[PDB]
Amino acid sequence: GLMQFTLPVRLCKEIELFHFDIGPFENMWPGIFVYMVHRSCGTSCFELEKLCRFIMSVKKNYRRVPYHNWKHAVTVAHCMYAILQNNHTLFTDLERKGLLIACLCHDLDHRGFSNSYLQKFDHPLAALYSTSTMEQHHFSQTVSILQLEGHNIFSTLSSSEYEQVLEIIRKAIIATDLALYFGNRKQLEEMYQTGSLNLNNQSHRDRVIGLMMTACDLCSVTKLWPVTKLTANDIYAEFWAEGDEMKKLGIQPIPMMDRDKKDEVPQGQLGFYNAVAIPCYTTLTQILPPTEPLLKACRDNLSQWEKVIRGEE
């Protein structure tokens, strides 16, 4: 009960900034997460014995894929931690509890392939879940780990609070399906502009938590240029592996997934920033002004990709 986690001074400070990189020392990532829960949520939120056992079971159910791995889970949780610490009073106790867990669990048992590839492969998960295929599986794996003896970190909630927290987690993890992001952002765009956006309307909060999830999930593009650029190799390692598996099923993949078209990555990253990432953090910054450092870092990285295209890197 009187047992804080405490990080070294450089991490104690930098962990508060949106652009913090959790480092290459895997054995520090559990303590980084517990640190973030204790400051976001309280030392009372979870039984440490149970939390520690839930964290290690979650870690074990992430695979050693180049991008959708345990490091991504912890990175996406740290971005959520930063959004919550910069928007103290906008979020319920339950919401802070559920969102840090949802971010940690959001890509559980990812295999490094998209929903599209599962459907073209005719994977069993595509018969069980016809839309948001991986995301419905990530939520399923979250509930399975919650039900392991010793792992129920929510056991001290009332029955109704327990149902609300699992419902926050389920919607948060489904919202990480980027196919749903485009419509969720448009609707938040219209509601903010026409002035109907109302954070006491549950269906409105849901949409806002959905956009926060998309912002956390895409947060590679909000790091300092050297982090963003070196991790871009991890995401293309997966895309191009999926492209190779497309060609083995007799299907030309899209260019993003075709390693023969590596040359056009710079222009492909431009599209992504322009069509997805900049719109995401713009609409987030309109709803939650203290998240503006994410939009500023995203814009800095777009401008670094523009320099790549102009032959200056």
Ligand X SMILES: Cn1ncc(C(=O)NCc2cc[nH]n2)c1C(=O)Nc1ccn2cc(-c3ccccc3)nc2n1
| Residues acting as catalytic residues | 68
Classify burial at 75, counting beta carbons within 10 Å of its beta carbon; exposed 0-12, middle 13-18, buried 19 or more. buried
Rounded distance between C-alpha atoms, residue 290 and residue 189, angstroms: 18
Binding site for 3',5'-cyclic GMP, by residue number, is 68, 269
CB of residue 256 to ligand X, shortest distance in Å? 4
Binding site for 3',5'-cyclic AMP, by residue number, is 68, 269
**Residue 44 three-state SS:** coil
Supply the DSSP symbol for 130.
Answer: S
Rounded distance between C-alpha atoms, residue 114 and residue 209, angstroms: 23
Give me the helix-helix angle, 159-174 and 202-217, nearest 10°. Answer: 50
Q: Which amino acid is at 53?
A: R
52 closest CA partner among 31, 36, 38? 31
Site residues for ligand X, 191-230, by CB under 6 A, read: 218, 220-221, 228
Question: What is the separation of C-alpha 78 from the centre of its chain, rounded to a whole number of angstroms?
Answer: 9
**By CB under 6 A, residue 265 contacts ligand X:** yes
Site residues for ligand X, 21-60, by CB under 6 A, read: none
Nearer to ligand X, 21 or 47 (CB): 21
Binding site, by residue number, is 68, 72, 106-107, 217, 269
- Both structure tokens of 81: 């931690």
Longest dimension (CA), the chain: 60
**By CB under 5 A, residue 107 contacts Zn ion:** yes
Nearer to Zn ion, 107 or 242 (CB): 107
**By CB under 5 A, residue 135 contacts Zn ion:** no
Site residues for ligand X, 84-143, by CB under 6 A, read: none
**By CB under 6 A, residue 268 contacts ligand X:** yes
Q: Which residues of 190-209 are buried (b: 16+ CB within 10 A; e: fewer)?
A: ebeeeeebeeeeeebbebbb
**Interface mask (CB under 6 A) for ligand X, residues 153-192, using x and -?**
-------------------------x--------------
CB of residue 86 to ligand X, shortest distance in Å? 22
CB of residue 251 to Mg ion, shortest distance in Å? 22
List residues near ligand X by CB under 6 A. 178, 218, 220-221, 228, 231-232, 235, 255-256, 261, 264-265, 268-269, 271-272
List residues near Zn ion by CB under 5 A. 107, 217
